[PDB]
C-alpha cells in the first residue's frame, strides 16, 4: 500500500493485478502465488490480529487399541472407547508448557508414546507426520490417522471451522518469498 498503490488491488482476500496501468509491467507469476498464499494463512489462522484459531477433534476407534491420549498445550483428550464427542481445541494457547504428544495403550504392551514434540509449533509437527485424507462422511472434515509403531493405527477426525483450520499452516512447508516482483526479459 506504499509502493504498489496503482498496480495491485486488495480485492476480497487475494491480491490481484490491476488491469489499468499494466502496460508492459508484468508480475513474476510466482510472486502472485506467494502473497496470495500469505494472505490466505492470514485469513485462517491470524484473523483477530494475532495467532489464534479453534478446531475440533473427534476421536476414532482402531483394532486393538485401548486408550489414545492426545495432549496439546495442556489440553487433554483421553479416549478409552466410549461414545465419541467433540473436543474444541485452541492453538496456540498461552499456557506454561506448549507442546504436543501422543501416547497409545495397546492390548499387548504398555503405553508407548508415538511422538513428543515440544515448543509452540508442536501441533503443526504432529499434523505433518499424519497420513491425512479428505473426509466424505463429515464436512468440512479431515480424517487423520497416525500410524504408530507395532502396526497399530490411531484414528482421529478433524473438523475445522473455516477454510482448512490448522492444516492450512502446512502450506508454509518449504515456502520462500520470491526475490523478484517484476519480471524483466
Amino acid at each position: 500500500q506504499n509502493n504498489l498503490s496503482g498496480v495491485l488491488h486488495r480485492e476480497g482476500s487475494r491480491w490481484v493485478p490491476d488491469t489499468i496501468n499494466t502496460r508492459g509491467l508484468t508480475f513474476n507469476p510466482a510472486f502472485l502465488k506467494a502473497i496470495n498464499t500469505l494472505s490466505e494463512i492470514a485469513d485462517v489462522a491470524f484473523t483477530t490480529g494475532n495467532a489464534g484459531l479453534h478446531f475440533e477433534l473427534r476421536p476414532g476407534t482402531a483394532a486393538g487399541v485401548m486408550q489414545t491420549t492426545l495432549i496439546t498445550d495442556n489440553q487433554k483428550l483421553i479416549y478409552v472407547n466410549q461414545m465419541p464427542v467433540w473436543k474444541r481445541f485452541t492453538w496456540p494457547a498461552d499456557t506454561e508448557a506448549p507442546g504436543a504428544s501422543l501416547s497409545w495403550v495397546s492390548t499387548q504392551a504398555g503405553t508407548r508414546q508415538y511422538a513428543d514434540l515440544p515448543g509452540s509449533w508442536g501441533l503443526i509437527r504432529l499434523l505433518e507426520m499424519a497420513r491425512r485424507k479428505a473426509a466424505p462422511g463429515v464436512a468440512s472434515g479431515w480424517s487423520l490417522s497416525w500410524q504408530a509403531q507395532d502396526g497399530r493405527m490411531l484414528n482421529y477426525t478433524l473438523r475445522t471451522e473455516a477454510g482448512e483450520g490448522p492444516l492450512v499452516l502446512l502450506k508454509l512447508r518449504n515456502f520462500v518469498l520470491p526475490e523478484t516482483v517484476f519480471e524483466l526479459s
Binding site: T61, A63, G64, M66, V80, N81, Q82, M83, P84, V85, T107
Partner: protein, 133 residues
C-alpha cells in the same frame, strides 16, 4: 452373618464386545460403583454419569474402580465393601450403548452378594448381563 464384607467379582468378557461400525471388538471400560442409594443411580443418563460429573450422584458414590475388559479376556475384582455402603453398581462405557432399554448397567444389591463365590458378569456386544447363580 455380618461377613459380606469382602466383595468378590469375576467379570468375563466374550469374544465380541463393544463393536464399532466395522464390527471390530474394542476393549471396553467397566466402571464399578458403590452407593448409598439406588434411586439416583437409576435416574441418571449415560451422558451425565461418565461425561462430566454430578454432586448428589457424586455424593452417593463412595467407592469406585475401573477395569479394562480385553476382548475375550477377563478380570478379577476384589475390593472391600464399605460398611455404610448398601448398594453396588456396575456400569460400562459402551461405544454405542442402548439408552432406551438401559442394558448398560446393573444394580447388584447388598443382600444379593455371595460371601466367597464371585458373581459372574458377562458382556456380549453392548449388554451387561447379570448371570443367574
Amino acid at each position: 452373618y455380618r461377613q459380606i464384607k469382602t466383595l468378590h467379582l469375576d467379570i468375563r468378557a466374550r469374544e465380541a464386545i463393544n463393536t464399532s461400525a466395522a464390527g471390530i471388538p474394542l476393549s471396553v471400560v467397566v466402571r464399578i460403583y458403590q452407593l448409598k442409594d439406588n434411586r439416583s443411580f437409576d435416574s441418571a443418563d449415560y451422558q451425565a454419569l461418565f461425561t462430566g460429573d454430578n454432586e448428589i450422584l457424586a455424593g452417593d458414590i463412595i467407592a469406585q474402580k475401573d477395569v479394562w475388559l480385553q476382548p475375550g479376556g477377563s478380570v478379577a475384582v476384589d475390593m472391600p465393601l464399605d460398611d455404610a455402603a448398601k448398594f453396588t453398581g456396575v456400569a460400562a462405557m459402551f461405544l454405542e450403548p442402548d439408552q432406551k432399554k438401559n442394558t448398560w448397567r446393573v444394580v447388584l444389591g447388598r443382600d444379593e452378594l455371595e460371601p466367597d463365590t464371585p458373581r459372574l458378569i458377562e458382556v456380549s456386544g453392548n449388554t451387561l448381563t447379570l448371570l443367574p447363580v
